[PDB]
Amino acid sequence: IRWLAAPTSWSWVEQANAHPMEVLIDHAHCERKAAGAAVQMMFRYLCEPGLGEALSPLAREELEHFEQVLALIKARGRYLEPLPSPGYGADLARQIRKGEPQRMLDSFLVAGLIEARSHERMALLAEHSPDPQLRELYSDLLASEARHFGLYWVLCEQRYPRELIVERLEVLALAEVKALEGALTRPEDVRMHSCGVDVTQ
Numbered sequence: 001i002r003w004l005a006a007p008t009s010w011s012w013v014e015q016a017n018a019h020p021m022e023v024l025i026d027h028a029h030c031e032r033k034a035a036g037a038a039v040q041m042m043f044r045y046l047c048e049p050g051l052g053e054a055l056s057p058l059a060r061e062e063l064e065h066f067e068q069v070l071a072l073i074k075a076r077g078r079y080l081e082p083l084p085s086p087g088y089g090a091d092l093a094r095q096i097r098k099g100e101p102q103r104m105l106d107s108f109l110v111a112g113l114i115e116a117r118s119h120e121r122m123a124l125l126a127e128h129s130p131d132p133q134l135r136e137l138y139s140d141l142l143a144s145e146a147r148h149f150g151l152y153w154v155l156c157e158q159r160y161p162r163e164l165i166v167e168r169l170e171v172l173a174l175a176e177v178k179a180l181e182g183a184l185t186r187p188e189d190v191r192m193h194s195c196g197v198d199v200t201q
Protein backbone atom coordinates (compact mmCIF):
# COMPACT_ATOMS: atom_id res chain seq x y z
CA ILE A 1 0.00 0.00 0.00
CA ARG A 2 1.34 3.41 -1.03
CA TRP A 3 -0.45 6.05 0.99
CA LEU A 4 0.93 9.31 -0.37
CA ALA A 5 0.68 10.47 -3.97
CA ALA A 6 3.67 12.85 -3.84
CA PRO A 7 6.60 13.57 -1.52
CA THR A 8 7.17 16.67 0.55
CA SER A 9 9.18 19.47 -1.07
CA TRP A 10 12.62 20.27 0.29
CA SER A 11 11.14 23.75 0.77
CA TRP A 12 9.25 22.43 3.78
CA VAL A 13 12.37 20.82 5.28
CA GLU A 14 14.20 24.18 5.05
CA GLN A 15 11.26 26.01 6.61
CA ALA A 16 10.90 23.44 9.39
CA ASN A 17 14.64 23.73 10.14
CA ALA A 18 14.37 27.56 10.27
CA HIS A 19 11.40 27.52 12.74
CA PRO A 20 11.65 24.22 14.65
CA MET A 21 9.56 25.36 17.63
CA GLU A 22 6.53 26.28 15.50
CA VAL A 23 6.69 22.77 14.00
CA LEU A 24 7.10 21.21 17.44
CA ILE A 25 4.19 23.11 18.99
CA ASP A 26 1.99 22.32 16.01
CA HIS A 27 3.09 18.70 16.24
CA ALA A 28 1.94 18.52 19.88
CA HIS A 29 -1.47 19.86 18.75
CA CYS A 30 -1.54 17.29 15.90
CA GLU A 31 -0.97 14.38 18.32
CA ARG A 32 -3.77 15.58 20.57
CA LYS A 33 -6.09 16.10 17.55
CA ALA A 34 -5.32 12.55 16.40
CA ALA A 35 -6.27 11.21 19.84
CA GLY A 36 -9.46 13.28 19.70
CA ALA A 37 -10.40 12.06 16.22
CA ALA A 38 -9.95 8.43 17.35
CA VAL A 39 -12.17 8.99 20.37
CA GLN A 40 -14.81 10.72 18.22
CA MET A 41 -14.77 7.79 15.77
CA MET A 42 -15.33 5.43 18.68
CA PHE A 43 -18.38 7.45 19.83
CA ARG A 44 -19.81 7.52 16.32
CA TYR A 45 -19.37 3.76 15.97
CA LEU A 46 -20.18 3.02 19.59
CA CYS A 47 -20.44 -0.80 19.54
CA GLU A 48 -18.65 -1.62 16.28
CA PRO A 49 -16.82 -4.94 16.80
CA GLY A 50 -13.05 -4.56 17.00
CA LEU A 51 -13.06 -0.77 16.83
CA GLY A 52 -12.60 0.08 20.48
CA GLU A 53 -9.91 -2.58 20.77
CA ALA A 54 -7.98 -0.83 18.03
CA LEU A 55 -8.72 2.87 18.53
CA SER A 56 -8.49 3.05 22.33
CA PRO A 57 -4.81 2.07 22.43
CA LEU A 58 -4.13 4.31 19.41
CA ALA A 59 -5.69 7.30 21.20
CA ARG A 60 -3.63 6.52 24.31
CA GLU A 61 -0.44 6.37 22.26
CA GLU A 62 -1.24 9.70 20.60
CA LEU A 63 -1.75 11.26 24.05
CA GLU A 64 1.61 9.78 25.17
CA HIS A 65 3.20 11.48 22.16
CA PHE A 66 1.42 14.75 23.02
CA GLU A 67 2.87 14.55 26.54
CA GLN A 68 6.36 13.69 25.27
CA VAL A 69 6.45 16.58 22.81
CA LEU A 70 5.00 19.00 25.39
CA ALA A 71 7.80 18.05 27.82
CA LEU A 72 10.41 18.90 25.13
CA ILE A 73 8.59 22.19 24.30
CA LYS A 74 8.98 23.24 27.97
CA ALA A 75 12.58 22.00 28.12
CA ARG A 76 13.18 24.50 25.23
CA GLY A 77 11.63 27.46 27.09
CA ARG A 78 8.21 27.58 25.48
CA TYR A 79 4.67 26.26 26.00
CA LEU A 80 1.65 25.30 23.95
CA GLU A 81 0.61 28.28 21.88
CA PRO A 82 -2.58 28.72 19.77
CA LEU A 83 -0.69 28.64 16.48
CA PRO A 84 -3.34 28.69 13.75
CA SER A 85 -3.54 25.33 11.92
CA PRO A 86 -2.95 25.11 8.18
CA GLY A 87 -5.98 24.58 5.86
CA TYR A 88 -4.91 20.95 5.40
CA GLY A 89 -7.05 19.40 8.14
CA ALA A 90 -10.28 21.08 7.06
CA ASP A 91 -9.53 20.39 3.40
CA LEU A 92 -9.26 16.68 4.15
CA ALA A 93 -12.30 16.70 6.45
CA ARG A 94 -14.36 18.15 3.53
CA GLN A 95 -13.63 14.99 1.46
CA ILE A 96 -15.41 12.73 4.00
CA ARG A 97 -18.75 11.71 2.53
CA LYS A 98 -21.95 11.87 4.55
CA GLY A 99 -23.81 8.62 4.97
CA GLU A 100 -22.66 5.17 5.81
CA PRO A 101 -20.94 3.01 4.76
CA GLN A 102 -18.91 5.61 2.81
CA ARG A 103 -18.40 7.83 5.85
CA MET A 104 -16.53 5.18 7.92
CA LEU A 105 -14.27 4.27 4.99
CA ASP A 106 -13.45 7.94 4.26
CA SER A 107 -12.81 8.63 7.98
CA PHE A 108 -10.30 5.79 8.28
CA LEU A 109 -8.58 6.68 5.02
CA VAL A 110 -8.33 10.40 5.88
CA ALA A 111 -6.90 9.54 9.33
CA GLY A 112 -4.38 7.21 7.71
CA LEU A 113 -3.34 9.79 5.10
CA ILE A 114 -2.69 12.42 7.82
CA GLU A 115 -0.61 9.89 9.78
CA ALA A 116 1.32 8.88 6.64
CA ARG A 117 2.12 12.49 5.80
CA SER A 118 3.26 13.10 9.42
CA HIS A 119 5.48 10.01 9.23
CA GLU A 120 6.94 11.08 5.91
CA ARG A 121 7.78 14.55 7.22
CA MET A 122 9.09 13.26 10.56
CA ALA A 123 11.34 10.89 8.60
CA LEU A 124 12.75 13.92 6.76
CA LEU A 125 13.49 15.79 10.02
CA ALA A 126 14.95 12.64 11.62
CA GLU A 127 17.58 12.67 8.86
CA HIS A 128 17.91 16.40 8.04
CA SER A 129 17.36 18.45 11.19
CA PRO A 130 20.62 20.21 12.22
CA ASP A 131 19.60 19.60 15.86
CA PRO A 132 20.56 16.18 17.29
CA GLN A 133 17.86 16.37 19.94
CA LEU A 134 15.18 16.86 17.27
CA ARG A 135 16.65 14.10 15.11
CA GLU A 136 16.39 11.82 18.14
CA LEU A 137 12.77 12.85 18.96
CA TYR A 138 11.55 12.41 15.41
CA SER A 139 13.48 9.14 14.90
CA ASP A 140 11.96 7.78 18.12
CA LEU A 141 8.43 8.51 16.81
CA LEU A 142 8.68 6.88 13.36
CA ALA A 143 7.88 3.25 14.19
CA SER A 144 4.70 4.15 16.03
CA GLU A 145 3.42 6.44 13.26
CA ALA A 146 3.89 3.62 10.73
CA ARG A 147 1.89 1.28 12.99
CA HIS A 148 -0.88 3.91 13.04
CA PHE A 149 -1.39 4.28 9.28
CA GLY A 150 -1.06 0.50 9.16
CA LEU A 151 -3.92 0.23 11.61
CA TYR A 152 -6.24 2.49 9.63
CA TRP A 153 -5.60 0.36 6.54
CA VAL A 154 -6.39 -2.84 8.46
CA LEU A 155 -9.66 -1.33 9.78
CA CYS A 156 -10.75 -0.69 6.16
CA GLU A 157 -9.56 -4.11 4.93
CA GLN A 158 -11.63 -5.86 7.65
CA ARG A 159 -14.90 -4.24 6.53
CA TYR A 160 -14.63 -3.43 2.80
CA PRO A 161 -13.68 -5.09 -0.44
CA ARG A 162 -10.05 -4.26 -1.27
CA GLU A 163 -10.59 -2.55 -4.61
CA LEU A 164 -13.18 -0.21 -3.09
CA ILE A 165 -10.54 0.86 -0.57
CA VAL A 166 -7.79 1.26 -3.21
CA GLU A 167 -9.99 3.33 -5.53
CA ARG A 168 -11.17 5.68 -2.79
CA LEU A 169 -7.64 6.10 -1.39
CA GLU A 170 -6.42 7.10 -4.86
CA VAL A 171 -9.00 9.90 -4.96
CA LEU A 172 -8.30 10.99 -1.38
CA ALA A 173 -4.51 10.88 -1.81
CA LEU A 174 -4.82 13.36 -4.70
CA ALA A 175 -6.94 15.69 -2.48
CA GLU A 176 -4.25 15.36 0.23
CA VAL A 177 -1.58 16.54 -2.26
CA LYS A 178 -3.77 19.47 -3.37
CA ALA A 179 -4.13 20.39 0.29
CA LEU A 180 -0.32 20.87 0.51
CA GLU A 181 0.11 22.92 -2.71
CA GLY A 182 1.04 26.57 -2.44
CA ALA A 183 3.76 28.72 -0.97
CA LEU A 184 4.32 29.55 2.66
CA THR A 185 3.40 33.20 3.40
CA ARG A 186 5.78 33.78 6.32
CA PRO A 187 8.55 31.62 7.82
CA GLU A 188 6.83 31.36 11.21
CA ASP A 189 3.69 29.90 9.53
CA VAL A 190 5.42 26.51 9.07
CA ARG A 191 3.50 23.55 10.59
CA MET A 192 3.58 19.76 10.44
CA HIS A 193 1.11 19.96 7.53
CA SER A 194 1.89 23.41 6.04
CA CYS A 195 2.33 23.69 2.29
CA GLY A 196 5.22 22.11 0.43
CA VAL A 197 4.77 19.18 -1.94
CA ASP A 198 6.68 18.09 -5.06
CA VAL A 199 4.15 17.29 -7.78
CA THR A 200 6.64 16.80 -10.62
CA GLN A 201 6.20 13.01 -10.64
Ligand SMILES: [Fe+3]
Nearest residue numbers: 031061062065
Ligand atom coordinates in the same frame (compact mmCIF):
# COMPACT_ATOMS: atom_id res chain seq x y z
FE1 LIG B 1 1.87 10.08 17.42
Ligand SMILES: [Fe+3]
Nearest residue numbers: 034115145148
Ligand atom coordinates in the same frame (compact mmCIF):
# COMPACT_ATOMS: atom_id res chain seq x y z
FE1 LIG C 1 0.08 8.60 15.15
